[PDB]
Design an enzyme around this catalytic site. Structure first.
Site, PDB file in Angstrom:
ATOM      1  NE  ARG A 130      28.903 -26.555  27.565  1.00 56.38           N
ATOM      2  CZ  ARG A 130      29.603 -26.039  26.311  1.00 56.38           C
ATOM      3  NH1 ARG A 130      30.944 -25.721  26.110  1.00 56.38           N
ATOM      4  NH2 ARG A 130      28.454 -25.674  25.505  1.00 56.38           N
TER       5      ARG A 130
ATOM      6  CG  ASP B  18      34.518 -28.427  24.228  1.00 57.77           C
ATOM      7  OD1 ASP B  18      33.612 -28.656  24.970  1.00 57.77           O
ATOM      8  OD2 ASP B  18      34.880 -27.497  23.315  1.00 57.77           O
TER       9      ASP B  18
ATOM     10  CD  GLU C   7      27.461 -28.102  18.279  1.00 60.71           C
ATOM     11  OE1 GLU C   7      27.106 -26.549  18.511  1.00 60.71           O
ATOM     12  OE2 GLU C   7      27.812 -28.637  19.134  1.00 60.71           O
TER      13      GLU C   7
ATOM     14  NE  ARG D 273      28.554 -23.398  17.000  1.00 60.51           N
ATOM     15  CZ  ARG D 273      29.047 -23.954  18.125  1.00 60.51           C
ATOM     16  NH1 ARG D 273      28.612 -24.677  18.818  1.00 60.51           N
ATOM     17  NH2 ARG D 273      30.276 -23.153  18.485  1.00 60.51           N
TER      18      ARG D 273
ATOM     19  NE  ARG E  77      28.275 -20.476  22.591  1.00 67.35           N
ATOM     20  CZ  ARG E  77      28.857 -21.618  22.695  1.00 67.35           C
ATOM     21  NH1 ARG E  77      29.068 -22.123  23.756  1.00 67.35           N
ATOM     22  NH2 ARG E  77      29.257 -21.992  21.529  1.00 67.35           N
TER      23      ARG E  77
ATOM     24  CE1 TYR F 193      26.978 -25.308  22.517  1.00 67.91           C
ATOM     25  CE2 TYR F 193      26.707 -27.631  22.172  1.00 67.91           C
ATOM     26  CZ  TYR F 193      27.329 -26.526  21.944  1.00 67.91           C
ATOM     27  OH  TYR F 193      28.414 -26.752  21.166  1.00 67.91           O
TER      28      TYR F 193
HETATM   29  C1  LIG Z   1      32.982 -32.197  19.875  1.00 65.38           C
HETATM   30  C2  LIG Z   1      33.072 -30.836  20.692  1.00 65.38           C
HETATM   31  O1  LIG Z   1      34.316 -30.309  21.068  1.00 65.38           O
HETATM   32  N1  LIG Z   1      31.982 -30.470  20.877  1.00 65.38           N
HETATM   33  C3  LIG Z   1      31.699 -28.854  21.134  1.00 65.38           C
HETATM   34  C4  LIG Z   1      31.628 -27.809  20.177  1.00 65.38           C
HETATM   35  C5  LIG Z   1      32.709 -27.985  19.143  1.00 65.38           C
HETATM   36  O2  LIG Z   1      33.739 -27.741  19.729  1.00 65.38           O
HETATM   37  C6  LIG Z   1      32.435 -26.823  17.969  1.00 65.38           C
HETATM   38  O3  LIG Z   1      31.108 -27.016  17.129  1.00 65.38           O
HETATM   39  C7  LIG Z   1      33.679 -26.964  16.804  1.00 65.38           C
HETATM   40  O4  LIG Z   1      33.671 -25.588  16.253  1.00 65.38           O
HETATM   41  O5  LIG Z   1      31.934 -26.769  20.607  1.00 65.38           O
HETATM   42  C8  LIG Z   1      31.683 -26.150  22.205  1.00 65.38           C
HETATM   43  O6  LIG Z   1      32.998 -25.700  22.473  1.00 65.38           O
HETATM   44  C9  LIG Z   1      30.929 -24.616  22.326  1.00 65.38           C
HETATM   45  O7  LIG Z   1      31.146 -23.861  21.353  1.00 65.38           O
HETATM   46  O8  LIG Z   1      30.148 -24.850  23.102  1.00 65.38           O
HETATM   47  C10 LIG Z   1      31.053 -27.410  23.078  1.00 65.38           C
HETATM   48  C11 LIG Z   1      30.827 -28.717  22.367  1.00 65.38           C
HETATM   49  O9  LIG Z   1      30.954 -29.704  23.182  1.00 65.38           O
END
Ligand SMILES: CC(=O)N[C@H]1[C@H]([C@H](O)[C@H](O)CO)O[C@@](O)(C(=O)O)C[C@@H]1O
Ligand SMILES: [Cl-]
Ligand SMILES: [Cl-]
Length: 449
Positions: A24, A49, A296, A312, A372, A412
């Site tokens: 990912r 994650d 993000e 975002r 998405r 993404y």
């Molecule tokens: C460090 C981390 O966990 N990054 C993750 C973010 C955060 O969890 C959110 O920005 C928090 O709200 O979100 C994802 O789950 C998503 O929505 O695709 C994937 C990504 O890797």
């Protein structure tokens, strides 16, 4: 169609590649030597994650007039200690008489058992005099610090019989007794978010050991503190030419998310934390507990060096912040762009090196829908429209082109400009954990099916 360029999508990472069940978080950057770099989460235990996932940093290279080379794991932590969400930056410095290039990568790092949902606060360091010392905890939650030659001191300032090597290995009586990043270690690192940095001097072939950017940078009141995946930029114009800009985001004690950038004026030797666009005359990103969260983000530079941060957020449309001091602070007006529907997913925005209809332009890519799906790449023309109450000019975006490049699932993504003026796209959406890459030209974006 007649004059458009568009390659059929290929898979750069997929389940099984490099023995990994999951992949990912695509990141894409082009070097001055024309090489395309594609970094990714090597999520070995699946797509989830952190926590409970052995995630490493992987990367692939494609030199100009060459093929995609084999993928390599360039950062790997013990056990299920995660390295998650990478960001790439090509940057140069005027050396002796040689303009040398260095590639920077920052990534969020968690010890075993921790991630965004359960992260604790603090930098992970204690300051004594002006020196930050890595904190360690025992099962009884007592505090220890790692100091000279890795010697572990207790809370009373006296030495223990423990030594921690740089890879967080714990030595007692000449024996390895654990690793500070592991859930089973006698002494553990603070279970909190770090940003680690590695760099490459040889066009992405080899990478340094990780340097923790937390000490002196992450605030003690922050809980999450992590890389905004995609890319950073080096400022080319204005008062802050040469400054490295890396988008990040963090949470305060109320778990409220705020976007920001970290920046460096000494070519990555030291870093400072800029304000969040959340920070205004009315609101503080340290104590805010309600309103639209900004998470993000990605940053692009205006012709005079003015910065634009695309974020975002928990609203319907993309939020754009403006900085006049190279990311140190953001104008207190942070509007939506009703042309950039934002369904709470990472986005990509980059500068384009050439004029488009006689204007400076940026390229944007995200899922243009309420979910998405419908991955769309947009072209934005830059237009001046007056100045601010301050002296700096005011830029606006004309979204002339808006091309669907993926009608189905699309999450993404990350754009980059190819050395020939074409565009590359490293994106999620092809399904079954496959990370896809495609190339196209500006004519492909002008076409309207
Ligand atoms: C460090 C981390 O966990 N990054 C993750 C973010 C955060 O969890 C959110 O920005 C928090 O709200 O979100 C994802 O789950 C998503 O929505 O695709 C994937 C990504 O890797
Ligand atoms: Cl279309
Ligand atoms: Cl899937």
């Amino acid at each position: 169609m007649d004059d458009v360029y568009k390659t059929q999508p290929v898979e750069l990472f997929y389940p099984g590649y490099l023995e990994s069940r999951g992949y990912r978080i695509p990141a894409l950057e082009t070097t001055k030597k024309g090489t395309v770099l594609a970094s990714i989460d090597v999520r070995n235990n699946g797509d989830h994650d952190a926590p409970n996932n052995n995630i490493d940093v992987g990367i692939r290279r494609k030199e100009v007039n060459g093929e995609w080379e084999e993928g390599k794991v360039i950062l790997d932590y013990p056990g299920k200690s995660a390295a998650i969400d990478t960001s790439l930056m090509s940057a140069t410095i005027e050396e002796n008489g040689i303009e040398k290039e260095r590639i920077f990568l920052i990534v969020t790092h968690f010890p075993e058992g921790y991630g965004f949902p359960n992260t604790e606060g603090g930098s992970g360091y204690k300051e004594i005099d002006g020196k930050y010392y890595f904190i360690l905890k025992d099962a009884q939650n007592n505090e220890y610090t790692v100091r000279e030659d890795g010697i572990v001191y207790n809370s009373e300032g006296n030495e223990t019989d423990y030594v921690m090597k740089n890879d967080k290995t714990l030595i007692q009586n000449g024996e390895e007794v654990g690793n500070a990043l592991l859930s089973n270690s006698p002494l553990k690192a603070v279970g909190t978010a770090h940003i680690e940095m590695i760099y490459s001097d040889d066009d992405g072939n080899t990478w340094s050991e990780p340097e923790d950017l937390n000490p002196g940078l992450k605030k003690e009141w922050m809980k999450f503190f992590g890389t905004a995946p995609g890319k950073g930029i080096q400022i080319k114009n204005g008062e802050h030419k040469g400054r490295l800009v890396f988008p990040i985001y963090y949470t305060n004690q109320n778990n409220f998310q705020s976007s920001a950038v970290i920046y460096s004026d000494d070519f990555g030797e030291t870093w400072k934390l800029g304000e969040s666009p959340i920070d205004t005359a009315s609101v503080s990103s340290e104590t805010v507990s309600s309103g639209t969260q900004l998470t993000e983000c990605q940053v692009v530079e205006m012709p005079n060096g003015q910065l634009k941060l695309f974020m975002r957020n928990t609203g319907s449309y993309t939020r754009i912040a403006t900085s006049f001091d190279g990311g140190a602070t953001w104008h207190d007006e942070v509007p939506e762009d009703t042309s950039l529907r934002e369904p709470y997913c990472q986005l990509s925005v980059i500068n384009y090196s050439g004029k488009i209809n006689g204007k400076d332009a940026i390229i944007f890519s995200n899922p243009d829908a309420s979910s998405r799906v419908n991955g769309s790449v947009k072209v934005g023309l830059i237009n001046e429209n007056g100045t601010y109450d301050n002296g700096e000019p005011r830029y606006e975006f004309d979204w002339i082109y808006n091309k669907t490049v993926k009608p189905g699932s699309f999450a993404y993504s990350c754009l980059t400009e190819l050395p020939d003026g074409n565009l590359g796209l490293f994106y999620e959406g092809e399904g079954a954990g496959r990370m896809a890459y495609t190339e196209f030209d500006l004519n492909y974006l002008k076409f309207n099916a």
